[PDB]
């Protein structure tokens, strides 16, 4: 079948067989092996023996360090330039720009970066040829969602980073059994490279292979391809997560009639023995993980975690909105995690966990801002910059977007239906973001269409999860601004169309704000475990309790309708204060944003809600 072989990479396979691969999978492996020119090919089997060799490899290359204080925990330190997502270098390629983003009326679009095929071809050909020279190409077969389940989606990620392989083993279901389930079926093509071919032209920082200058994360939904170059950080390199399960999947969901959202899924049980499931979309670094693992302070209440970041939802034959968590672990923000804020996370991350960019203690432990644990005398701290660090410096010991990567099955409060292929029934959806002023603690939408408008109007302070600085209040509708895989106007019409479904049991929609501050600049709400008091009110509202009061922005709890026992000091007046002056400016900014950014793709029912809210505020 060949004249000089040349295209047969069988001699370079150090684990597995190209013969054992399905036809379309081998073509994908061999085609990119010809282009990237790796020295070795490793077909992953997901075994414990393989994971051990990958760790020892990384440890011999100075990529990770063993945290001897815990059981099978490891620390990785990255280049300070490769620490988070880069929204400005995350592009979607479609034939028509209108399929990716609405055509803005004035400025440029904030709802996604579109790039033509012709432009991406030039960018691709300038990066990937020979990019894996001297390195191993790992072939990761992985499933998003329970293996063998009909709703699960399968991908193949090619990467030259063992750090990516080890993280994908935690965050997805990967190995030989996925190739057996895939067969000749369709799979999502994922290609990743750190962009540092050997021999090294440039010296690496902290032994972290990356190419910041050429970083590009590209999505080709028409070709079911994800192509990532230059970055090793999880959001850019774990292509099953944000790239697949949110950006690519949101477009497939639009085409197939389901939903892919940036949401946690939890189950909450009340003292009367009743349990309901809730989903919550908060922007990055705005509280999803802490809410989904919450230890409630109300007696008789129990929270269980289905997932903390991504939800795939679909109406069943009975009209229930059912959700699954397609992920296999948690990729959570480390700073702020303590026994008092998220004790269930502390119990989880003590074994089989990979930490990135946190501080190391001299006795083999971890440290970060907000850990709230004193160290023993003589224990010294090494910062994420691999330097000596004292508590009286200015640099934090851990990067603000440092992460743990831990298996979901180790969480003490993991929900017993978290791997159920039928999903869990959602009865409530929660929106919310970081708003230091104006936005009350919690309110309830007036209808399904008003609730969609509430999601579309979400604003929040910038965080360390992306490249945004200044804590400026940005728009982040549905917490999905960095993750839309298609036109945001069509996304809104997709959400609105669910109210047309026959026998659809539409959940209630709430909006919360844990982050409101007083005149002094400190938080008015204790949050974390105390957020169970807000969830209690939502639970009763779903049951139909008459505990709400009508306001121009929606329903708020009645007086003495929230359980505030054990606090008392809470300035309830400022937690639910609705200033006409604040909200007149808020609707103006929402109006200017929706008019410019969504333009002719803005559904009329969203504009009608904007006009209705503007009228109710003027009547105050
Ligand atoms: N004041 C206050 N801070 C909170 C609360 N919940 C979480 N935080 C802090 O906000 C930061 C982000 O919390 P996470 O739960 O990790 O945010 P996330 O939504 O899961 O973010 P991603 O994983 O990037 O999607 C953490 O450092 C927490 O300490 C809260 O209820 N009140
Ligand atoms: O990493 C995440 O979950 C993010 O950036 O939202
Ligand atoms: Mn997230
Ligand atoms: Mn999280
Ligand atoms: Mn309608």
């Amino acid at each position: 079948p060949q004249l000089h072989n040349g295209l047969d990479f069988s001699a370079k396979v150090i684990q597995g067989s190209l013969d054992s691969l399905p036809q379309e999978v081998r073509k994908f492996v061999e085609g990119n092996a010809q282009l990237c020119q790796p020295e070795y090919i490793h077909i992953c089997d997901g075994s414990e023996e393989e994971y051990g060799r990958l760790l020892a490899h990384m440890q011999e290359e100075g990529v990770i360090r063993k945290l001897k204080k815990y059981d099978n925990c490891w620390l990785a330190l990255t280049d300070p330039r490769d620490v988070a997502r880069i929204e400005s270098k995350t592009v979607i390629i479609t034939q028509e720009q209108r399929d990716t983003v609405p055509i803005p009326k004035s400025g440029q679009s904030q709802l996604g970066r579109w790039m033509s095929e012709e432009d991406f071809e030039k960018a691709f050909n300038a990066r990937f040829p020979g990019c894996m020279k001297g390195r191993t190409m790992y072939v990761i077969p992985f499933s998003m969602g329970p293996l063998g389940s009909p709703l699960a989606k399968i991908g193949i990620e090619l990467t030259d980073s063992p750090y990516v392989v080890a993280s994908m083993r935690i965050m997805t279901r990967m190995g030989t059994s996925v190739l057996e389930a895939l067969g000749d079926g369709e799979f999502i093509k994922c290609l990743h490279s750190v962009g540092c071919p050997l021999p090294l032209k440039k010296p690496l920082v902290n032994n972290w292979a990356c190419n910041p200058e050429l970083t590009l994360i590209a999505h080709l939904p028409d070709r079911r391809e994800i192509i990532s170059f230059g970055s090793g950080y999880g959001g850019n390199s774990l292509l099953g997560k944000k790239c697949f399960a949110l950006r690519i999947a949101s477009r497939l969901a639009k085409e197939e009639g389901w939903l892919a959202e940036h949401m946690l899924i939890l189950g909450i049980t009340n003292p009367e023995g009743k349990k309901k499931y809730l989903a919550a979309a908060f922007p990055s670094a705005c509280g999803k993980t802490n809410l989904a693992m919450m230890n409630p302070t109300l007696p008789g209440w129990k929270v269980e975690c289905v997932g903390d970041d991504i939800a795939w939802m679909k109406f069943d034959a009975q009209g229930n909105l059912r959700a699954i968590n397609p992920e296999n672990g948690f990729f959570g923000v480390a700073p702020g995690t303590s026994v008092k804020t998220n004790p269930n996370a502390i119990k989880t991350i003590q074994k089989n966990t990979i930490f990135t960019n946190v501080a190391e203690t001299s006795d083999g432990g971890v440290y970060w801002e907000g850990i709230d644990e004193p160290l023993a005398p003589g224990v010294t701290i090494t910062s994420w910059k691999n330097k000596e660090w004292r508590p009286q410096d200015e640099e934090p010991c851990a990067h603000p977007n440092s992460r743990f990567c831990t298996p979901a099955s180790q969480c003490p409060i993991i929900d017993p239906a978290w791997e159920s292929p039928e999903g869990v029934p959602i009865e409530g959806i929660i929106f919310g973001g970081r708003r230091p002023a104006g936005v009350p603690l919690v309110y309830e939408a007036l209808s399904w269409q008003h609730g969609v408008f509430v999601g579309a109007a979400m604003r929040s302070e910038a965080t360390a999860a992306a490249e945004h600085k200044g804590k400026v209040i940005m728009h982040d509708p549905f917490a999905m601004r960095p993750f839309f895989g298609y036109n945001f106007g069509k996304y809104l019409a997709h959400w609105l169309s669910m109210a047309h479904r026959p026998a659809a049991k539409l959940p209630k929609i709430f909006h919360v704000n844990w982050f409101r501050k007083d005149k002094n600049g400190k938080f008015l709400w204790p949050g974390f475990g105390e957020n169970s008091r807000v969830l209690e009110w939502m639970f009763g509202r779903i049951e139909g309790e008459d505990s709400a009061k009508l306001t121009p922005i929606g329903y708020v709890p009645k007086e003495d309708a929230l359980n505030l026992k054990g606090l008392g000091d809470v300035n309830v007046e400022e937690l639910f204060g609705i200033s006409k002056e604040f909200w007149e400016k808020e609707v103006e900014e929402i109006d200017k944003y929706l008019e410019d950014q969504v333009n002719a793709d803005l559904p009329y029912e969203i504009e009608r809600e904007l006009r209705a809210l503007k009228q109710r505020i003027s009547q105050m």
Side-chain angles (χ1 to χ4, degrees):
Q2 289 160 9
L3 292 180
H4 304 278
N5 284 335
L7 309 180
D8 189 4
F9 274 76
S10 294
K12 284 188 151 58
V13 177
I14 54 177
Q15 173 175 311
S17 176
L18 297 177
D19 305 305
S20 297
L21 292 177
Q23 179 186 20
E24 296 303 324
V25 178
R26 178 170 187 174
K27 295 179 180 297
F28 179 59
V29 172
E30 279 188 331
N32 290 282
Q34 185 187 4
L35 173 81
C36 302
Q37 292 288 311
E39 187 66 19
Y40 312 96
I41 301 179
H42 177 118
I43 301 173
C44 296
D45 63 9
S47 68
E48 289 287 349
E49 292 79 357
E50 162 178 277
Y51 190 62
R53 284 188 296 270
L54 295 176
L55 290 168
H57 174 48
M58 275 182 287
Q59 190 178 17
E60 291 163 12
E61 310 286 357
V63 186
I64 57 178
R65 289 180 46 88
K66 192 171 196 301
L67 298 159
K68 53 177 182 294
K69 187 169 185 166
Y70 313 115
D71 176 18
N72 189 35
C73 289
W74 306 82
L75 174 61
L77 306 181
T78 73
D79 194 308
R81 299 165 300 192
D82 188 18
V83 296
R85 291 187 285 97
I86 306 176
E87 296 177 9
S88 57
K89 295 172 168 51
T90 309
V91 300
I92 300 180
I93 295 97
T94 55
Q95 178 64 25
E96 299 297 324
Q97 182 187 358
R98 195 173 186 172
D99 292 332
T100 292
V101 295
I103 303 304
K105 194 175 181 180
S106 290
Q108 70 178 12
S109 179
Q110 302 187 15
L111 299 165
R113 275 212 50 173
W114 176 82
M115 177 184 301
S116 73
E117 291 83 355
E118 291 75 7
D119 293 335
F120 172 69
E121 276 194 0
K122 306 178 176 58
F124 182 86
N125 289 331
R127 288 161 168 82
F128 279 91
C131 69
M132 289 187 183
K133 284 175 185 175
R135 298 193 181 271
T136 302
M137 168 191 290
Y138 297 91
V139 185
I140 311 171
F142 66 92
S143 178
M144 303 306 295
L147 180 61
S149 176
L151 48 82
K153 292 289 183 296
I154 287 173
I156 305 282
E157 170 160 358
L158 314 175
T159 182
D160 53 6
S161 169
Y163 172 89
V164 166
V165 191
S167 301
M168 289 287 293
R169 188 180 192 269
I170 297 172
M171 295 303 302
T172 73
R173 297 137 175 100
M174 59 158 292
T176 299
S177 64
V178 180
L179 285 174
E180 306 176 355
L182 169 63
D184 291 334
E186 298 180 359
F187 58 96
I188 300 300
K189 304 164 190 177
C190 308
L191 168 63
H192 172 258
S193 169
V194 289
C196 291
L198 302 173
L200 295 188
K201 302 297 183 303
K202 318 169 186 177
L204 301 187
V205 183
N206 281 326
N207 299 286
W208 191 255
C210 70
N211 195 319
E213 301 181 344
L214 296 178
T215 299
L216 189 63
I217 304 91
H219 306 73
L220 292 85
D222 299 337
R223 285 153 56 97
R224 280 83 170 91
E225 293 183 6
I226 300 171
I227 301 179
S228 188
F229 185 89
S231 171
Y233 170 80
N236 303 330
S237 64
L238 314 182
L239 302 184
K241 188 169 171 68
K242 303 294 192 180
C243 298
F244 180 8
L246 278 176
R247 296 200 192 88
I248 294 293
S250 69
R251 172 157 168 167
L252 302 178
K254 160 68 201 311
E255 296 171 354
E256 302 164 16
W258 47 291
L259 299 168
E261 303 295 340
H262 189 205
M263 290 177 183
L264 68 91
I265 306 160
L266 57 79
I268 179 166
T269 301
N270 77 341
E272 305 289 344
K274 277 80 171 186
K275 176 176 180 177
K276 299 183 180 307
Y277 287 86
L278 305 176
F282 309 142
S284 308
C286 284
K288 290 188 298 302
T289 295
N290 283 261
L291 185 61
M293 299 184 185
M294 153 180 49
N295 192 80
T297 62
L298 296 182
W301 289 82
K302 183 179 186 179
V303 169
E304 294 168 284
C305 174
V306 179
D308 78 329
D309 195 62
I310 305 169
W312 288 0
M313 309 190 296
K314 145 185 294 295
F315 287 102
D316 60 12
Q318 318 295 334
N320 301 288
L321 185 58
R322 308 199 72 91
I324 64 109
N325 168 26
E327 296 193 299
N328 200 28
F330 309 118
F331 186 71
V333 174
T337 308
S338 69
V339 186
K340 76 178 191 65
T341 65
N342 200 344
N344 288 316
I346 297 292
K347 294 182 175 182
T348 306
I349 61 176
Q350 290 189 357
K351 56 185 180 184
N352 306 312
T353 294
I354 298 182
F355 294 92
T356 303
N357 285 342
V358 302
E360 179 179 3
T361 62
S362 56
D363 58 352
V366 292
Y367 216 76
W368 50 70
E369 279 67 20
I371 194 171
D372 207 356
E373 292 194 47
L375 291 177
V379 175
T380 57
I381 305 179
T382 295
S383 73
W384 71 285
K385 294 187 178 65
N386 205 46
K387 301 175 184 177
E388 277 291 337
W389 182 91
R390 294 188 176 183
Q392 290 189 343
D393 295 356
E394 190 191 20
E395 291 285 340
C397 68
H399 188 273
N401 194 43
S402 57
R403 300 266 174 176
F404 54 83
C405 188
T406 190
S409 65
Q410 292 186 167
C411 183
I413 54 166
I414 193 73
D415 194 84
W418 84 277
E419 278 185 310
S420 292
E422 71 275 16
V424 299
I426 301 300
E427 301 183 47
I429 299 174
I430 307 173
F431 296 120
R434 286 168 180 272
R435 298 301 306 268
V439 186
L441 175 65
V442 57
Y443 62 94
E444 178 186 324
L446 306 165
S447 64
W448 182 253
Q449 296 78 29
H450 180 238
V452 175
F453 168 82
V454 168
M458 285 177 57
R459 298 173 75 196
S460 181
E461 294 190 343
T463 65
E467 72 276 34
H468 307 283
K469 302 295 190 61
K471 261 184 170 59
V472 143
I473 300 183
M474 302 179 60
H475 292 261
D476 197 339
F478 288 76
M480 282 280 293
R481 188 199 71 251
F483 308 122
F484 289 118
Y486 66 104
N487 191 303
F488 173 53
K490 308 308 175 190
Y491 172 97
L492 294 172
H494 191 55
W495 267 84
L496 290 171
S497 72
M498 299 300 177
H500 306 163
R501 294 243 177 179
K505 302 172 187 177
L506 298 177
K508 265 172 159 42
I509 288 170
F510 302 94
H511 187 275
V512 308
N513 179 26
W514 315 138
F515 303 94
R516 192 171 182 169
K517 299 182 178 182
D518 57 0
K519 308 173 184 176
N520 301 336
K522 59 185 179 182
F523 296 99
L524 291 165
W525 185 245
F528 303 107
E530 301 304 330
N531 295 333
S532 58
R533 305 167 187 273
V534 179
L535 263 57
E536 177 180 31
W537 183 79
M538 301 175 187
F539 196 104
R541 285 300 293 164
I542 295 178
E543 288 196 339
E545 297 187 6
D546 184 66
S547 57
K549 179 182 60 179
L550 184 54
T551 75
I553 69 167
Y555 296 111
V556 307
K558 290 183 179 183
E559 301 185 12
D560 290 327
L562 274 178
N563 192 350
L564 299 177
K565 304 177 183 182
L567 302 176
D569 53 351
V570 173
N571 180 18
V572 296
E573 290 176 342
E574 197 174 350
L575 264 76
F576 289 91
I578 301 177
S579 170
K580 179 180 180 171
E581 305 177 355
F582 170 84
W583 283 96
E584 283 189 331
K585 311 175 185 303
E586 189 70 12
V587 293
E588 288 186 5
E589 290 301 315
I590 301 168
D591 189 13
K592 296 193 297 198
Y593 176 82
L594 291 180
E595 175 183 0
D596 174 59
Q597 289 296 309
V598 199
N599 192 18
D601 284 315
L602 179 64
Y604 167 75
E605 289 188 323
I606 301 295
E607 182 189 350
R608 179 172 60 187
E609 292 302 321
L610 180 64
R611 295 191 178 201
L613 178 54
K614 188 137 189 168
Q615 183 71 15
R616 298 195 296 275
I617 295 175
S618 66
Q619 297 296 314
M620 296 182 62

